[PDB]
Design a protein around this motif. Structure first.
Motif, PDB file in Angstrom:
ATOM      1  N   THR A 187     -50.553 -13.905-153.267  1.00 51.04           N
ATOM      2  CA  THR A 187     -50.034 -12.542-153.288  1.00 51.04           C
ATOM      3  C   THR A 187     -51.010 -11.575-152.623  1.00 51.04           C
ATOM      4  O   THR A 187     -52.168 -11.468-153.027  1.00 51.04           O
ATOM      5  N   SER A 241     -49.792 -10.180-149.046  1.00 50.71           N
ATOM      6  CA  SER A 241     -49.023  -9.761-147.879  1.00 50.71           C
ATOM      7  C   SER A 241     -49.897  -9.768-146.628  1.00 50.71           C
ATOM      8  O   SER A 241     -49.787 -10.660-145.788  1.00 50.71           O
ATOM      9  N   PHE A 251     -46.293  -4.513-144.457  1.00 49.32           N
ATOM     10  CA  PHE A 251     -46.316  -3.930-145.794  1.00 49.32           C
ATOM     11  C   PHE A 251     -47.396  -2.860-145.900  1.00 49.32           C
ATOM     12  O   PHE A 251     -47.099  -1.679-146.082  1.00 49.32           O
TER      13      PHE A 251
END
Length: 45
Positions: A2, A4, A8
């Motif tokens: 986790t 990105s 984003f």
């Protein structure tokens, strides 16, 4: 995993909103090492 990394946190900048210290120390050395020896073209004092 986790984080990105891309697509984003591109709104404006990385995720310095969490690294803050390490991102300012890491980025701090970044600018402090944008060459090799701090460049001595005309600033050797």
């Amino acid at each position: 995993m986790t984080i990105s990394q891309q697509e984003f946190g591109r709104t404006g900048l990385p995720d310095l909103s969490s690294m803050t210290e390490e991102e300012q120390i890491a980025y701090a050395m970044q600018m402090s090492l944008q060459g090799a020896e701090f460049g001595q073209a005309e600033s050797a004092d």
